[PDB]
Design a protein that fits this description.
homodimer; 103 residues; alpha+beta; Alpha-Beta Plaits; 4-stranded antiparallel beta sheet; 4 helices; globular; binds magnesium ion; metal ion binding (chains A, B); magnesium (chains A, B); HS1/DABB1-like (chains A, B)
Chain lengths: 103, 103
Amino acid sequence: PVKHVLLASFKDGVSPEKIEELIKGYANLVNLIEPMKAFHWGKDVSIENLHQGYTHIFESTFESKEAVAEYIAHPAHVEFATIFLGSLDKVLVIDYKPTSVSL
Amino acid sequence: PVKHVLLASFKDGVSPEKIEELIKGYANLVNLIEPMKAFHWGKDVSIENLHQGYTHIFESTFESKEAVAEYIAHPAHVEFATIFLGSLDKVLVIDYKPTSVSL
Ligand SMILES: [Mg+2]
Ligand SMILES: [Mg+2]
């Protein structure tokens, strides 16, 4: 359905340990928030030098645009987002419905 | 394996028709380039106002980091990239190996 993509840069002084702690917390929102169905992440390993300072990507899966909105309004999201966003330099969010060249 | 993510903003004066033409061309690289295995895209429909001016996302799937490198070096990529990049304002690329909280 709808993929919720967040790209991030962790601020100076955020440890690798705090990053893995934060990522486990973000992923836990699957469990805490009904509409969020799955969570995957990655550290950038590109070679093109086009990452624009972002180092990580987080993708969460939803069944609809309305489900993403419910997630954003959910008090567990609002609480955790303060924690997570507090450790970021850069953030970028895009939501899309995966489309392909299909018949 | 490795997901190759490109975020884009189309420059002023690129028509919706030229965009769909360009997207069909990018997607065709699946066919032209062995290492590229699948292609999906989306227009941003986020509500958070965090998209940083990017409007589209393109995700291509590869089997390895080496396969992405082969794609970048492939002459069909080099030719088409001039065309596609010529119509962009903003571009951002990240490659990642999808990771999850798993046992
Ligand atoms: Mg859930
Ligand atoms: Mg191919």
